[PDB]
Structures are given as C-alpha cells and as structure tokens.
Symmetry: C2
Subunit: 155 residues, 2 copies
C-alpha cells in the first residue's frame, strides 16, 4: 500500500528528528558530512546555535547566528538535508575526537564493554571519519543507532 | 515521543488491515477465535459476505448478510475486534483443515519446504486450534505472518 510506504517514511522522519533533537540537546554540537567530508557544523555557543559552513580546504567560509532557532527546528533542518541525499549525507554528534584501539582485527571504543585494559593510555585520539564504515568496529563494545545517517556511536 | 507511539499504532493498524483485506480477497473465509475458541465466521457465500456467530456448543446462533459491506470495511471491523483484546482475539484465514505430520519433535505443513515425503498420504487433516502455539512448528516448512493475531500460516 502507498499509504503504508508514506506512513513508514513519516515515522522514520519523526524517529530520526527525535534522535537528532536529543543528540543536539545532550552534546550541543553536530558535524554534517557529505561523502565523509565535513561541510558544516551546528554548535551551541553562548545562548544560541551557530551554523558554520566550511570549504573543501576545511576553511570557515560562513558563520550564522541561528538566534531563536530551537533544537527541534534545527533537527528538522538537519533531517531535510539528510533525506535529499541519504546515501552521502551523514552527521557526527559530540566531540569530534574518539579514543580507539586496534586488537584482534577489530577497532574498539570500550563504550558498551571493557574489551581493552589500560585503554585510556593504550588508545589513540582519532577524528570521526573512521566510523563511516561500521564493518571494522567491535560489536561488543561499539554500538550505533539503527539510523545509517548517524555516524557517531550511540553513547 | 507519544506522537511516535501513536504513529506506530496507526501503522500497525494499516498493515494488519491490509493483511486481513488480502486474506479475505484470496480465501474468502475467516474464523474469529477468542482464547482459541471459534466465536464467529465471515465467509463470502454467493455475492455477499455473511457473518455467522456461534455459541460455546459451536451452534450457529446468528447469520447476518453484510450486504454491501466491502472486504476493506470488514478488515477494519476485524481489526477493531482484535485491538480491543489483542492477547485473546486471533483470526484463522482459509479452509479450517490443514494436513499436518509429526517428525523429529516438530510439526510440519510442507509449505515452505518438502520436509516430509509422501506427505499427502502420511499426513492427518486437523482443525486450526493447534496453530495457536507457534513454538511446535518446523521453522523451515511452516511460516507465520509477523502479526501474532493471525493464527493461520502464511501460505
Ligand atoms: Zn571491543
Ligand atoms: Zn518441516
């Protein structure tokens, strides 16, 4: 049924916006990536959200005070960006840097299970880009939102 | 989010009505069971659907020509009956009798796989009630709709 395919899309929307809303209200910062290149940033600085746009040389090319813009309205703007090009448009929520350690042909965060000991000292601080391919990540300590468009590990 | 819980319930409704609608348009007969006891029957006889209500002694106590009633409108009436008491109200679609055979601590229908040989002759014709507990059926030859309220095997 077409009505069921529409209902499924509007439900996915409501759930992905709610996910983004909560991520923005918690971490206060989201990176927008197109083909695993950061193209924008929305960060709560002061008492407002600021929308930074970057060029291919990772130079700040724009800075916009979203002023009154709510977390929920920004979440909707971010979904509208994703759904236009869902195979290439992904978002990173939180501090860009993650401590990761390689062992037994898997990469580890130690988020959902302490796979690595003295992790804090044996780990390396690494940018978001490596999380684009979920296949290399340990399924015991590293979990992700069911949404393929959220690159950042859940917790 | 409450709106997501409501959207999920309306989507389950649309999917379960569409499932019932198709089952009615195919087999033309549905048994309504409450605690695995047949309490009603909707069957396409002639050019209309007829609604037979039974008592605990399986006696026809009523027969109602639904007249103009469409399969979609009847599917909706059957959903409204289910969702009132979803743990006890199930439906059987098609011929009440199914050929079943016991082997290797599993019951077989030979629907999705030829589990049994000379099945047609080694099998026994059996009412719907045994399909209430899905735990006892070969998962290779016997499949059910994801909807727990449709007792009858898919195909
Ligand atoms: Zn691990
Ligand atoms: Zn079988």
């Amino acid at each position: 049924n077409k009505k069921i395919i529409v209902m499924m899309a509007l439900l996915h929307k409501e759930k992905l916006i709610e996910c983004i809303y909560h991520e923005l209200e918690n971490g206060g910062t989201i990176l927008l990536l197109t083909k695993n290149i950061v193209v924008s940033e929305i960060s709560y600085i002061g008492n407002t959200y600021k929308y930074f746009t970057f060029n291919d040389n990772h130079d700040l090319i724009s800075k916009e005070d979203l002023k009154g813009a709510t977390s929920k309205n920004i979440a909707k703007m971010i979904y509208n960006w994703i759904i236009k090009n869902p195979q290439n448009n992904k978002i990173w929520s939180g501090e860009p840097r993650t401590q990761i350690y390689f062992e037994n042909d898997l990469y580890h965060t130690n988020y959902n299970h302490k796979c690595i000991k003295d992790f804090w000292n044996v780990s390396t601080s690494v940018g978001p880009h490596i999380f684009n391919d979920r296949s290399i990540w340990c399924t015991k300590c590293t979990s992700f939102y069911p949404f393929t468009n959220i690159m950042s590990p859940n917790i």
